[PDB]
Design a protein around this ligand. Structure first.
Ligand code: HEM
Ligand SMILES: [Xe]
Ligand SMILES: [Xe]
Length: 183
């Protein structure tokens, strides 16, 4: 993934746990040589998965749980590190934002030419609920999506109840979530 993602990981770990903890994770991930991540440069996805695994081990958290926190963090990180106006432009509510997400990533992809963005499709079941389809070229990121949804809930001061109903990993086509939301 692009360096930006790995920078967010480093920043979250450093902020929540300290530089020493980050260094331990970075070493454990096999990344000691890398002095810094380059935000607009592409890295092997392996770099990210290794950080997740190393974070899980050092912190003593399940990786899924850690990925949820990271997904929530991303919503704040992007808004603060150069993508605040882009985020704002994608909407004023959770369901509008999710409808705009593919277009938001298309905009990102203008600048990040190698982007492999996720694809999100909404099927609205009421004015306060939807079924969300998450399609990706990558494995393992559903729990990050859960955190992102909670991050968006906070952003829009909206209560969000989310349950995963289909699993990419268990052979099923793609991840699907049932979501209810209210003010
Ligand atoms: C705020 C709501 C957002 C959600 C829910 C979201 C969702 C995701 C997800 C799930 C991925 C994982 C990649 C995959 O599934 O294959 C991803 C990747 C990525 N996103 Fe978004 N995203 C959001 C906002 C943003 C914003 C504001 C930016 C601005 C830079 C951004 C840029 C990226 C980048 C650079 C990647 C790495 C993909 C790659 O390197 O190929 N995202 N996003
Ligand atoms: Xe991300
Ligand atoms: Xe990640």
């Amino acid at each position: 993934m692009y360096g930006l993602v790995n920078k967010a990981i480093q920043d979250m770990i450093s902020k929540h746990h300290g530089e020493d903890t980050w260094e331990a994770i970075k070493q454990k991930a096999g990344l000691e040589d890398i002095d810094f991540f380059v935000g607009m440069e592409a890295y092997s996805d392996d770099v990210t998965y290794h950080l997740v695994g190393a974070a899980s081990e050092v912190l003593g958290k399940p990786a899924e749980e850690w990925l949820i926190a990271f997904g929530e963090y991303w919503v704040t990180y992007t808004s603060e590190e150069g993508y605040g106006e882009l985020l704002a432009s994608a909407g004023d509510s959770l369901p509008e934002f999710m409808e705009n997400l593919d277009n938001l990533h298309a905009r990102v992809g203008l600048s990040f030419p190698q982007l492999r963005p996720p694809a999100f499709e909404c099927q609205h079941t009421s004015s306060k609920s939807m079924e969300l389809h998450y399609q990706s070229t990558r494995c393992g990121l559903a729990p990050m999506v859960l955190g992102l949804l909670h991050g968006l809930g906070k952003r829009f001061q909206t209560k969000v109840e989310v349950t995963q109903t289909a699993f990419r990993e268990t052979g099923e086509d793609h991840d699907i979530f049932s979501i209810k939301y209210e003010d």
